[PDB]
Amino acid sequence: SDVQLVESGGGSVQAGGSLRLSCAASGSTDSIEYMTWFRQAPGKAREGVAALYTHTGNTYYTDSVKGRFTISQDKAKNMAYLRMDSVKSEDTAIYTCGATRKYVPVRFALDQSSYDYWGQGTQVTVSS
């Protein structure tokens, strides 16, 4: 593969609390256009959660996490982060970071089909 993604962080967190997930990109990183977190909650389809356009830092969220999660990047260190603030039970899921080197319009930024490279999947478990 020409890009590799490795996640770190995750695990247990109390409701209302915060955790930060990280994703380190390696390989052909200058060409990455979006870094985007997906998740797959228990017994659900995978869904796009938070997308970041690398050129500008603009961000796009699924409705259920708006006002709670923040995605950010560190271009120099080829990192993306998901700040899971204000966590809720509905957030328990496998979180997986995706990346693409092919620009797509914003309306496709949360679609699975837009991404070519994937991290390993990281469990986050919220307690009430």
Author numbering: 0 to 127
Sentences from the paper on this structure:
Among them, miniature single-domain antibodies derived from the variable region of the heavy chain-only antibodies of camelids have gained relevance due to their high therapeutic potential and the robust techniques employed to generate them. The usefulness of VHHs relies on their ability to specifically recognize antigens with high affinity despite their small size. The kinetic parameters of the interaction between the VHH antibody termed D3-L11 and its antigen HEL were determined by surface plasmon resonance (SPR) analysis at 25 °C. The values of the association rate constant (kon = 6.1 ± 1.6 × 106 M−1 s−1) and dissociation rate constant (koff = 7.9 ± 1.7 × 10−4 s−1) were determined as described in the methods section, resulting in a dissociation constant in the sub-nanomolar range (KD = 0.13 ± 0.04 nM).
The X-ray structure of WT D3-L11 in the absence of the antigen was also determined, achieving a resolution of 1.15 Å. The coordinates of unbound D3-L11 were aligned to those of the antibody in complex with HEL using the Cα atoms of the residues of the framework region (FR). The conformation of the residues contributing to the affinity did not change significantly in the unbound form compared to the antibody-antigen complex (RMSD = 0.76 Å among main chain α-carbons). Collectively, the X-ray data suggests that the interface residues of VHH contributing to binding the antigen adopted a rigid conformation. The structural data showed only minor differences in the conformation of the main chain between unbound and bound D3-L11, suggesting that preorganization of the interaction surface is a key aspect of the mechanism of recognition. The rigidity of the residues comprising the interaction surface would ensure a highly cooperative mode of interaction of the three CDR loops, enhancing the affinity for the antigen. To clarify the conformational fluctuation of these residues, the R2 dispersion parameters were determined by NMR. Those residues with significant fluctuations (Rex > 5 s−1) were exclusively located in the FR3 (Lys74, Met78, Tyr80). Except for Val103, residues in the CDRs showed little fluctuation, suggesting that the CDRs were little dynamic in solution, in agreement with the conclusions extracted from the crystallographic data. In conclusion, the paratope of the VHH antibody D3-L11 recognized its epitope by a lock-and-key mechanism, and is organized similarly to that of a conventional antibody (Fvs).
